[PDB]
Amino acid sequence: SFEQAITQLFQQLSLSIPDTIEPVIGVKVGEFACHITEHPVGQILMFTLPSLDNNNEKETLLSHNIFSQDILKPILSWDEVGGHPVLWNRQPLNNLDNNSLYTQLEMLVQGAERLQTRSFS
Amino acid sequence: SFEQAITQLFQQLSLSIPDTIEPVIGVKVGEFACHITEHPVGQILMFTLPSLDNNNEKETLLSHNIFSQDILKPILSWDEVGGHPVLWNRQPLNNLDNNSLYTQLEMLVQGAERLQTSSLISPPRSFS
């Protein structure tokens, strides 16, 4: 059912339907590299690694996480292993329809856009 | 199906079943007042307002929100409307079990207990 979900999603996005479906699928939407996988079993998980800013205060960052009427609104978190932010959303694979994966990906990138409101090595 | 959930819950918790069942139900465990409600429709939301500390840094507080295998692991957030922190979890009202609503409340409370910092001995504080 996961393979069917990724297949259907790639179709809707006009993406080359993979004959081989890896555990973690990748889809880039502009500057946001999104990852799609099943975890835990029966749950579709999508995450992106946003680039926050030291300027943001704790309460402001935590404000993004308040619940809303949309269960797909993404959660802003931190991965202590890698040492960087992680924005993610999740939904059940049992209760999934034709616009589901597509909508979850859209909700994730919109949440990522909301986190932005440069120097490099 | 929501009222059917609050009953089984209160029953496993040996609580008095109200006469009206407000859209938002309240259950208090220890020092944590936990609010329960169906939001959005079909989803059972539980939340409590935990006491935090400037001690914890932004990365520490956000690290509590990483995804894991447990979908009931609560989320720490901030409610800018009320101006306070909110810890919450949520699960499909159409997939509950004879141990789900319970495990959800337990996960929320355990999450709040861990964020709390209590004095060894609470001193007497004045007020009006």
From Swiss-Prot, chain B:
Matching Gene3D superfamilies: 3.30.1460.10
Source species, domain of life: Bacteria
InterPro entries listed in its UniProt record: T3SS_chp_SycE, Tir_chaperone
Gene Ontology annotations of biological process type: protein secretion by the type III secretion system
Keyword tags: Activator, Plasmid, Transcription, Transcription regulation, Virulence
Protein role: Positive regulator of YopE.
Name of this protein: YopE regulator
